[PDB]
């Protein structure tokens, strides 16, 4: 399921912020506007297992260029809350659930 990092108006938000996806699918975080954008998975309030580095980006990496995607396969029952380390203070916090 594709979600764009940052709004067209330069807003620092995900497009849609809340993703309700089915298992067997992988999210692609494509860059839109306001990049460099980073997607980091919480590590907390996260189901059972799932190690953080598997779905996180290094807390010191950033996607560049207008059209760059980050690929995460997920596939684990529960909900995952993700956020953007640089713009987490501007409300760039999202959430993906797999039911």
């Amino acid at each position: 399921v594709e979600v764009l990092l940052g709004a067209s108006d330069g807003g620092l938000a995900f497009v849609p912020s809340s993703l309700e996806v089915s298992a067997g699918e992988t999210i692609v975080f494509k860059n839109n506007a306001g990049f460099p954008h980073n997607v980091v998975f919480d590590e907390d309030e996260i189901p059972a297992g799932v190690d953080a580095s598997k779905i996180s980006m290094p807390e010191e990496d950033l996607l560049n260029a207008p059209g760059e995607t980050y690929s995460v396969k997920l596939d684990a029952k529960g909900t995952y809350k993700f956020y953007c380390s640089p713009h987490q203070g501007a409300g760039m916090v999202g959430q993906v659930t797999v039911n």
Binding site: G6, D9, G10, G11, L12, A33, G34, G89, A90, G91
Partner: protein, 146 residues
């Protein structure tokens, strides 16, 4: 400084995120990144190669205030003598050219006075200051409306 403090505190309170200000206010990099750089995305995106929105007028003013202020640095750094000599050579050139020496100035051109130059530089500095900050504040608060 007063208005930076007020605006950052209130923009973080209006988001229910007073913590963020509490963490990032203690050091100056927090002010530079979490306030100026962070709250300045929609404003600078007011218009871009993919179109414009209602904030473009501010994005333009934001740049306008940056220009005025910068040209203020001119009158504040460069002083009179250089400009006086430049104007002297300009007067020579105008008086020595065909078809335009038929037109004659009536008040002898001169460089701005020292006090006048200081005043003009200060006026540019202040106008640019005010315009750029007003653009930033209105665009960032109105961009989120919260």
């Amino acid at each position: 400084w007063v208005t930076f403090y007020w605006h950052w505190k209130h923009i973080t309170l209006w988001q229910g995120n007073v913590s963020q200000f509490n963490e990032s206010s203690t050091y100056l990099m927090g002010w530079l990144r979490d306030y100026l750089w962070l709250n300045s995305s929609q404003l600078i995106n007011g218009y871009n190669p993919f179109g414009m929105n209602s904030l473009s007028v501010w994005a333009w003013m934001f740049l306008f205030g940056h220009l005025v202020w910068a040209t203020g640095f001119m009158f504040l750094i460069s002083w009179r003598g250089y400009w006086q000599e430049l104007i002297e050579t300009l007067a020579w050139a105008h008086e020595r050219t065909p078809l335009a020496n038929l037109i004659r100035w009536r008040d002898k051109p001169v460089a701005l006075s020292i006090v006048q130059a200081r005043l003009v530089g200060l006026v540019h500095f202040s106008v640019g200051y005010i315009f750029t900050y007003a653009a930033f504040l209105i665009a960032s608060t109105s961009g989120k409306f919260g």
